[PDB]
Design a protein around this ligand. Structure first.
Ligand SMILES: [Mg+2]
Ligand SMILES: [Zn+2]
Ligand SMILES: [Zn+2]
Lengths: 64, 137, 103, 201, 91, 214, 102
RNA sequence: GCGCCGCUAGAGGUGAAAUUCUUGGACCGGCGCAAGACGGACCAGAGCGAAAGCAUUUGCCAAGAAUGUUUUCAUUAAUCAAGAACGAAAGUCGGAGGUUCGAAGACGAUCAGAUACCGUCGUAGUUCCGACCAUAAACGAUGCCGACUGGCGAUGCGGCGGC
RNA sequence: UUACGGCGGU
């Protein structure tokens, strides 16, 4: 039910997406091990390397 | 403590989890080692009320969590996989809920044994429901 | 229904050209009771007490009974005549090996 | 007056020294001077009669008993048969499939001759003239020249009368109509030319 | 010589009964009057008695066959299936 | 309101003594309610399980079926029912520009256990081979397929069920037609694809009690 | 004009090849005209690999493959963009596009 | 499709839905059974055939190409009015069968209207046996027979020779 | 998902 709200650090930004250039993909690292890393999407200006907060942990990235 | 088999502190008892990930829906039915006795059949179309989203990866994600929460609470603690597509006459690749009901079946504290795709394949048997010119869309 | 019948009805139309033979019931009944018969061939059509008393005399004369897989009208064409025939007896094979075969 | 032929079979009486003759519905394919075997441990060939509980699922059956020992009631007309499925060896009941396509669960010890009734294909030929229908029913009954009730008089039928030959009243009637009023389509579930197959169980 | 061109056996029915009913009859009518080859003596002497009854001139054997023809194709399929069910499962 | 899983008890499933791991797993069944007795609800259950959790170091692409024929209290004793390969193995070996030869035969053992054997073989590309199609000719296929079924008729007809089922944990039938066919056309992926059970000999009780003995 | 030298179809000494059916529209095509594509896709969806090997009963388990052979009509092959439009002299090669797996 | 179980409340269908099937328990999972279709992947710019066309094993046949030939006959030949044989699919007549698919038709959607596309259902028909009908973008849109005129990489079948 | 027309001569 309650997932731990996991703060996360981004490596390399994978370019814009979202059909209007509004969303970007970050492939966060999970702030416990940089070995464990998933691909995600965020909105707004990103600034490569910084830290962002995940209210939900793992569902899906931009992928058909 | 009335429910549960007799295991040790380290070992686990096996059940199979039939994934039927078609389009329009997804099934994350778990049952015993022979398949005859149903443990829990919950569906991605029983926890969304939209009817678009029955084949969604997200409805399959929480159907996999709900079937794990029933299975683990009953004493049966490790799963084999028998993923299906629609199969037979129809398509033979599984739908969007296939992977997400598999990963979230494991992220919610559950082991995984042998997996297999067990979809129905004909031997060049039967006609398809499209017409000769197919469906035109 | 593909390969093997012209073991026994290609040899039968070769004895018919080369060797000696008798057709009909009461001629192979004479040849069986005076030693001259070698291999009697019964059709799959003959009445079942006729099939018995030829299987019984051939035990008495120590000769062989081959059960042909066909009609009595089919055994007649396999002989090479315009008849029907249940029972034949070859009394000399010409140069083939019907007796030297399985029965 | 029957469309099927018969077969008279002489058995050997087990208790008296006597040969006694039965009359069977002729299963199709049988010939005279054929041995016919009848029992529980009889072997499943054409014309042999043996209980429906021992024979396998999907064998074709004619002249079968609807209650045990009733000496043959069902599936007896010329060319007709019944199929067995679904043995239940506990509470011994087997279901068969009647010539009308309607299935019926019957007792397991019901007895039945294996095969189809001879004389089949009979209704494929046209009667083709009024004279050969006359000889058909002279063997059967006094039933053949059927006068339409529209053609007769108001004493004689509910439909007759009028200056035009018309029925007037609706020709579908209820089932609890009395005698002398049940004429026409008696308790008809539907009318008109049929579509589908029958779609009502 | 050449006595007809279409009707054949149903030239006895004259102008009567309809063309398509006379055409429907002449398959049935050539078939119930035909001699068939006997499967027991090989002689083509299977004449039809009453409906469903078939009989040999020589060897005097009576066969219970079809109505307008010696074998019904429904009854040959069953005899195929009965001997198949008798060699399958061995009861 | 009622929970039907509180009325169910756990039995454990045992494989015969022909295998290393004797314990398959645990099934469940409801208890006795009058005519619903708790033994015929789990006689005749199929347990589609692989070799690598039934041997120790054997392959994983092969699986056994194992019907249940008897219940011994808390135990649930089994007997062999059939085998096949997995899907992913059986369609990783069907590739283009090679011949797939396949045979099948109905052979019964001397114990009365009529089987249907399914075997496959695929032609093999040679090491110096430059051309693309490693096809067989048709009369080569017919005599290979004759050679396949003649050998597995030997390996099953002669002796009982135990030595038969023991032959195809290493699959020495597929290795025996491997050697006996490579003077006709060489083959490389030669398995017994499937074994199907057609008959059972009335289930003498002591025969199953032999299989769970030593 | 005759557009292509074959007529879209790889039949030369035949009069009739088998009709098969397209996958995403169920339209009936000849077997030789049909645009085949044989997908050897891993069943695990590679982002979800370290979530099943850390929740398996082994440390080294080879993952099964999903072997789905698609085949398309040319109508749905151009719409789903598995064949691209080509120029009138760069049509004339039968080599498939290169791999580009990494 | 039907039996015997298991546990559950939805299943199905779609761009979204609905008509529809479902606590007289659908769908799903297990084990069986029956019926009728159809022979996947192997399957190819491969083979055979006069063309239409032809694909699961094994079985009685009858044919045929090519190659091999220091066999035989010795112009027996090519094309061919008239005349015939074969001929996809749909269609017609009769008897079997009837699983799926499905013209006609009914219904739900979609639209301004929908007699269309799309969805649920379904008749004739698709399957077999017998008789017909003789047409197709029956196409390599290219008659058949004969010789001659570049190269190259192969492939299918015979034959010959080589590490 | 829906997207139907555009008077004649120049
Ligand atoms: Mg009248
Ligand atoms: Zn006779
Ligand atoms: Zn398509």
């Amino acid at each position: 039910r309650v997932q731990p709200i996991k703060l996360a650090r981004v490596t390399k930004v994978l370019g814009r997406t979202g059909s209007q250039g509004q969303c970007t993909q970050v492939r966060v690292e999970f702030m416990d091990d940089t070995s464990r890393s998933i691909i995600r999407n965020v909105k707004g200006p990103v600034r490569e390397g910084d830290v962002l907060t995940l209210l939900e942990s793992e569902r899906e990235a931009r992928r058909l | 403590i009335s429910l549960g088999p007799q295991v040790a502190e380290g070992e686990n008892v096996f059940g199979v989890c039939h994934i039927f990930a078609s389009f329009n829906d997804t099934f994350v039915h778990v049952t015993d080692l022979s398949g005859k006795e149903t443990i829990c059949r919950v569906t991605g179309g029983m926890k969304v009320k939209a009817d678009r989203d029955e084949s969604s990866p997200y409805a399959a994600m929480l159907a996999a969590q709900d079937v794990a929460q029933r299975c683990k609470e009953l004493g049966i603690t490790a799963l084999h996989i028998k993923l299906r597509a629609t199969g037979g006459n129809r398509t033979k690749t599984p739908g969007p809920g296939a992977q997400s009901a598999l990963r979230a079946l494991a992220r919610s504290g559950m082991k995984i044994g042998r997996i297999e795709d067990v979809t129905p394949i004909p031997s060049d048997s039967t006609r398809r429901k499209g017409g000769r010119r197919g469906r035109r869309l | 229904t593909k390969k093997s019948l012209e073991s026994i009805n290609s040899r039968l139309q070769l004895v018919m050209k080369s060797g000696k033979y008798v057709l009909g019931y009461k001629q192979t009944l004479k040849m069986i009771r005076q030693g001259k018969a070698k291999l009697v061939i019964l059709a799959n059509n003959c009445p079942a007490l006729r099939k018995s008393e030829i299987e019984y005399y051939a035990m008495l004369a120590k000769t062989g009974v081959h059960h042909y897989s066909g009609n009595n009208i089919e055994l007649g064409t396999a002989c090479g005549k315009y008849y029907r025939v249940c029972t034949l007896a070859i009394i000399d094979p010409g140069d083939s090996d019907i007796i030297r075969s399985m029965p | 007056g029957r469309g099927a032929p018969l077969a008279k079979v002489v058995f050997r009486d087990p208790y008296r020294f006597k040969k006694r003759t039965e009359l069977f519905i002729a299963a199709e394919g049988i010939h005279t001077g054929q041995f016919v075997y009848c029992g529980k441990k009889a072997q499943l060939n054409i014309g042999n009669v043996l209980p429906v509980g021992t024979m396998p699922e999907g064998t074709i059956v004619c002249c079968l008993e609807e209650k045990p020992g009733d000496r043959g009631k069902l599936a007896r007309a010329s060319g007709n048969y019944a199929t067995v499925i679904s043995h239940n060896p506990e509470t011994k009941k087997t279901r068969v499939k009647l010539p009308s396509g309607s299935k019926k669960v019957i007792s397991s010890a019901n007895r039945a001759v294996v095969g189809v009734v001879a004389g089949g294909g009979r209704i494929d030929k046209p009667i083709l003239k009024a004279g050969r229908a006359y000889h058909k029913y002279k063997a059967k009954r006094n039933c053949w020249p059927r006068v339409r009730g529209v053609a007769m008089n108001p004493v004689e039928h509910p439909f007759g009368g009028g200056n035009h030959q018309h029925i007037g009243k609706p020709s579908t009637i209820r089932r609890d109509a009395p005698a002398g009023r049940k004429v026409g389509l008696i308790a008809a579930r539907r009318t008109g030319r049929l579509r589908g197959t029958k779609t009502v169980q | 010589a050449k006595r007809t061109k279409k009707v054949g056996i149903v030239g006895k029915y004259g102008t009567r009964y309809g063309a398509s009913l006379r055409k429907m009859v002449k398959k049935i009518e050539i078939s119930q009057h035909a001699k068939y080859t006997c499967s027991f003596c090989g002689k083509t002497k299977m004449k039809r008695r009453a409906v469903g009854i078939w009989h040999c001139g020589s060897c005097m054997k009576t066969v219970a066959g079809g109505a307008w023809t010696y074998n019904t194709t429904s009854a040959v399929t069953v005899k195929s299936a009965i001997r198949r069910l008798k060699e399958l499962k061995d009861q | 309101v009622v929970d039907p899983f509180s009325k169910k008890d756990w039995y454990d499933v045992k494989a015969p003594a022909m295998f290393n791991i004797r314990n398959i797993g645990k099934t469940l069944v409801t208890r006795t309610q009058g005519t619903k007795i708790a033994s015929d609800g789990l006689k005749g259950r199929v347990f589609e399980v692989s070799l690598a959790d039934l041997q120790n170091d054997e392959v994983a692409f092969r699986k056994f079926k194992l019907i249940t024929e008897d219940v011994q209290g808390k135990n649930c004793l089994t007997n062999f029912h059939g085998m096949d390969l997995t899907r992913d193995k059986m369609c990783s070996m069907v590739k283009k520009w090679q011949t797939m030869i396949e045979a099948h035969v109905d052979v019964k053992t001397t114990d009365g256990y009529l089987l249907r054997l399914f075997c496959v073989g695929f032609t093999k590309k040679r090491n110096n081979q430059i051309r693309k199609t490693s096809y067989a000719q048709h009369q080569q296929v017919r005599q290979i397929r004759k050679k396949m079924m003649e050998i597995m008729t030997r390996e099953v007809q002669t002796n009982d069920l135990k030595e038969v089922v023991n032959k195809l944990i290493p699959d020495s039938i597929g290795k025996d037609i491997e050697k006996a066919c490579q003077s006709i056309y060489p083959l490389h992926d030669v398995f017994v694809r499937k074994v199907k059970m057609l008959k059972k000999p009335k289930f003498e009780l002591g025969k199953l009690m032999e299989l769970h003995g030593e | 004009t005759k557009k292509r030298r074959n007529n879209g179809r790889a039949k030369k000494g035949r009069g009739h090849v088998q009709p098969i059916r397209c996958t995403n529209c169920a339209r009936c095509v000849p077997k030789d005209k049909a645009i085949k594509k044989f997908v050897i896709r891993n069943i695990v969806e590679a982002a979800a690999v370290r979530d099943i090997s850390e929740a398996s009963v082994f440390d080294a388990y080879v993952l099964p493959k999903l072997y789905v052979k698609l085949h398309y009509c040319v109508s749905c092959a151009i719409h789903s963009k598995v064949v691209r439009n080509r120029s009138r002299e760069a049509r004339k090669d039968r080599t498939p596009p290169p791999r580009f797996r990494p």
